[PDB]
Amino acid sequence: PLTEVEQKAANGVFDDANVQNRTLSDWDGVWQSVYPLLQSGKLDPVFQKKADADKTKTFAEIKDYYHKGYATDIEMIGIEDGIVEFHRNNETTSCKYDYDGYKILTYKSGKKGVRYLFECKDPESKAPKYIQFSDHIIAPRKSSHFHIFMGNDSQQSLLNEMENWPTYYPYQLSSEEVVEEMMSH
Ligand SMILES: [Zn+2]
Ligand SMILES: [Zn+2]
Ligand SMILES: [Zn+2]
Ligand SMILES: [Zn+2]
């Protein structure tokens, strides 16, 4: 239903006074890394239509951007009931994360983002200690796909990465369904 104002927001325009707190369950769902769709060339039409409206960019450099961009080996995230399970190699880790606010970011492009931060306070879980969802939303609302940044250093390091953003769409969707979305977008 996306409003028109929620849309200048997704594009990185918003007043820092409009961001609001979100909860872990904006991101409940079972979810699939779109990386394998990069790798089998399933996403090219996206990177195509994009070099078609960017004269600074060739199909080549765009693809290379999303390659470095989506690379993860967390194949699959499942989030539900306060817990986040990561699937890397026929083995999950999970942890009951705790909301720890949001950082507002301004990118080198003058453009802005909000990372909604969480942390694992479980001594006994083996999940990443620090996670940050960023999903182009600034206020409570169910995600449609998201970037998650994850690490065990601090929050600030993650805040520092602009290089990698493993990107997740819902498991329901077909490859055909995923690309469709990244165009109508
Ligand atoms: Zn501020
Ligand atoms: Zn698995
Ligand atoms: Zn993004
Ligand atoms: Zn989308």
Swiss-Prot record:
Q: Which organism does this sequence originate in? A: Escherichia coli (strain K12)
Q: What does this protein do, in the record's words? A: May function as a periplasmic zinc chaperone or mediate direct transport of zinc from the periplasm to the cytoplasm under zinc-limited conditions. Binds zinc with high affinity, and can also bind cadmium, mercury or nickel. Preferentially binds Zn(2+) over Cd(2+). Contains one high affinity metal binding site, and can bind additional metal ions at other sites.
- Per UniProt, Zn(2+) 1 binds at 136, 145, 147
The cellular location(s) given in this protein's UniProt record come to:
Cytoplasm; Periplasm
Task: Locate the transmembrane regions by residue number.
Answer: none
Which family is it part of?
Belongs to the calycin superfamily. ZinT family.
Highest taxon above the source species: Bacteria
| Source lineage | Bacteria, Pseudomonadati, Pseudomonadota, Gammaproteobacteria, Enterobacterales
What name appears for this protein in its UniProt entry?
Metal-binding protein ZinT
Q: GO terms for molecular function, please?
A: cadmium ion binding; metal ion binding; zinc ion binding
Question: A biological process (GO) annotation for this entry?
Answer: cellular response to cadmium ion
| Metal-binding keyword on record | yes
Protein keywords: Cadmium, Cytoplasm, Metal-binding, Nickel, Periplasm, Signal, Zinc
InterPro entries noted in UniProt? Calycin, ZinT_dom
Q: Name one GO cellular component term.
A: outer membrane-bounded periplasmic space
- Give the residues the record marks as binding Zn(2+) 2: 145, 181, 185
Q: What happens when the protein's gene is inactivated?
A: Mutant shows a growth defect and a lowered cellular Zn(2+) level under Zn(2+) limitation. Mutant does not bind cadmium.
Entry keyword annotation includes Cytoplasm: yes
Inducing or repressing factors: Repressed by Zur. Up-regulated in response to extreme Zn(2+) deprivation. Also induced by cadmium and hydrogen peroxide.
